[PDB]
Amino acid sequence: MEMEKEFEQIDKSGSWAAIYQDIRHEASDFPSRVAKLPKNKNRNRYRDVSPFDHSRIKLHQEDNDYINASLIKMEEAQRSYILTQGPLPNTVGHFWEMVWEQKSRGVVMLNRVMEKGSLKCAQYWPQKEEKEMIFEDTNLKLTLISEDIKSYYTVRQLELENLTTQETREILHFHYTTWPDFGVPESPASFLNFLFKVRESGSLSPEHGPVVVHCSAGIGRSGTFCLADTCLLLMDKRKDPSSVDIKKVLLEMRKFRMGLIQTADQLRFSYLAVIEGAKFIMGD
Numbered sequence: 222m223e224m225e226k227e228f229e230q231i232d233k234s235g236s237w238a239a240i241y242q243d244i245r246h247e248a249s250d251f252p253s254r255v256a257k258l259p260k261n262k263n264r265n266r267y268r269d270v271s272p273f274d275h276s277r278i279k280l281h282q283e284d285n286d287y288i289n290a291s292l293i294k295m296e297e298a299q300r301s302y303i304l305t306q307g308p309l310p311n312t313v314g315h316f317w318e319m320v321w322e323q324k325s326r327g328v329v330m331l332n333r334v335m336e337k338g339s340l341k342c343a344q345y346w347p348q349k350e351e352k353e354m355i356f357e358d359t360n361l362k363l364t365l366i367s368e369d370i371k372s373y374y375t376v377r378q379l380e381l382e383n384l385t386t387q388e389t390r391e392i393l394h395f396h397y398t399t400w401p402d403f404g405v406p407e408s409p410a411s412f413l414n415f416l417f418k419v420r421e422s423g424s425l426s427p428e429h430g431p432v433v434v435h436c437s438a439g440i441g442r443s444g445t446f447c448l449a450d451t452c453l454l455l456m457d458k459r460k461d462p463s464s465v466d467i468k469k470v471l472l473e474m475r476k477f478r479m480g481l482i483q484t485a486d487q488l489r490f491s492y493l494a495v496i497e498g499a500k501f502i503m504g505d
């Protein structure tokens with residue numbers, strides 16, 4: 222069923238809450254035993270948001286390999302994403318270790334450091350060229366190379382140096398800065414523009430490790446980003462773009478990380494973004 226018609230039918234009936242609860246009821250439940258070990262309590266931002274054991278990212282160290290991060294592998298679309306929480310004061314070094322080990326080219330940030338008067342994630346990147354950051358626990362150095370501030374997002378160029386081998390790589394930081402403190406954006410236009418800027422960079426392409434995506438918990442805004450990208454790619458690949466079922470794509474992604482899309486309003490916004498984005502994908 223053409224999703225644009227499914228959309229108007231849900232909106233006219235006002236059943237968004239009912240569709241959303243059906244997804245929550247059918248979603249996968251897999252063990253998260255490593256996340257719940259007592260040694261890992263200060264590595265989790267939220268007690269109710271954990272990576273599944275089967276899909277968690279492992280840090281390459283014998284001490285403790287744990288980070289709150291999952292690999293979302295979309296077989297038909299041929300795209301992979303790492304979804305992670307906003308880093309904590311004691312996990313900023315683990316975060317950059319993961320970027321290094323997984324060979325990622327891009328980091329996508331969908332939140333502000335402070336929202337609603339509270340801290341949603343650590344200040345994990347340098348704000349001035351001449352004041353670099355050293356992570357002594359993981360032996361990495363991070364330098365700000367350049368910054369491009371636009372109305373809806375900021376793009377930064379950073380140098381990550383493995384202090385053990387003196388190898389260096391260029392990481393691009395894509396920072397969406399205008400998601401509102403409450404609700405979802407009224408139009409998906411600036412979110413779609415942002416997505417196409419990340420695509421243009423090469424950050425989502427198979428020649429690099431998976432993109433790292435985060436918000437505060439790494440399930441809500443983060444879920445919206447990967448769901449929209451995968452649905453638009455499937456609409457370009459298939460003989461019938463009308464066959465793409467956004468609810469079925471979301472349940473596939475929920476096999477790899479719990480809780481993706483946190484509200485009925487985020488589900489409606491995801492539909493709006495895919496419907497409006499398709500009017501480029503189909504030749505405009």
Ligand SMILES: OCc1ccccc1N1CCOCC1
Nearest residue numbers: 366378379380389390391392
């Ligand atoms: O590509 C140039 C560059 C721009 C910005 C930040 C880092 C880098 N590099 C990556 C490869 O060479 C070593 C540092």
